[PDB]
Design a protein around this ligand. Sequence first.
Ligand SMILES: CC(=O)[C@](C)(O)C(=O)O
Ligand SMILES: [Cl-]
Length: 312
Amino acid sequence: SMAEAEFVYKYANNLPDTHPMNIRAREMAAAIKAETNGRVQIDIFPSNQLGSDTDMLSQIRSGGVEFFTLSGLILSTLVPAASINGIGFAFPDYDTVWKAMDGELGGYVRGEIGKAGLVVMDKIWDNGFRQTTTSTRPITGPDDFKGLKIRVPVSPLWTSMFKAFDASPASINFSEVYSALQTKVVEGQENPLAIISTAKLYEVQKYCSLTNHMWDGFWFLANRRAWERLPADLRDIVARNINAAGVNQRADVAKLNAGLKDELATKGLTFNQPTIGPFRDKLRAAGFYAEWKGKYGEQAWSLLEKSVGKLA
Ligand SMILES: CC(=O)[C@](C)(O)C(=O)O
Ligand SMILES: [Cl-]
């Protein structure tokens, strides 16, 4: 038989194999294997094949897997600073997002991730600005969130935000979301359009409300020991290829989130665009911005403010 590659590394993720994350990860793995002359093989385990997000967070820490893409908000139980990009209504556009995440704010978060003992690639991958879906009624204003049994990912930031909206959040890994919606364990969830599409959540929801309540992405994490075990030449090749795949993935995801509404509207989702201001007002009145300013500290909060104020 053919000898195994010297380094056979596992990359786990939580998304469908049809999402740009996985399309680009497959291109990335092929490029890496060729460029390292067969020395590095990245085996990809999409859509929670090896386990759920909370499981994989444990595994990237312990070395059970070598690579894992993860929202900073989920990561934030280990790295408290890493939820900072998810502050409600903070970023007005992608322009400010990438300048921040590829600039000083992202540098700050990456440094915090390093302090916790993980490696993280320079470029965060996209997920997108998040919308709401339900099987009950549309969300036209913040009053409609009262009592809503809404699924959220496991994170203090998501819990805080949806409690501030007077909803009843349930913390559930993405792997259980389709079934939880289908069976009405929960009444709704929130995610970018590209997720609603690729995970077919339109099959098990009726309404999509464009609440546009945060932007979030996926840090590309590496187990530190496994990263350091790669010789320097291979490390450089792997890092370059992961970041290149990320840049392409961002471009793919931006196009999907910009254009998917019309397609989703003919697949079993009825859309509405609520007026956004009252939602931001509700988070303010609930003390959400004051809470998180306190938790992140003045320096980090000032860095977030600097980041979102850009006009270009
Ligand atoms: C944060 C994240 O990984 C997802 C897929 O968007 C989610 O769990 O909803
Ligand atoms: Cl609409």
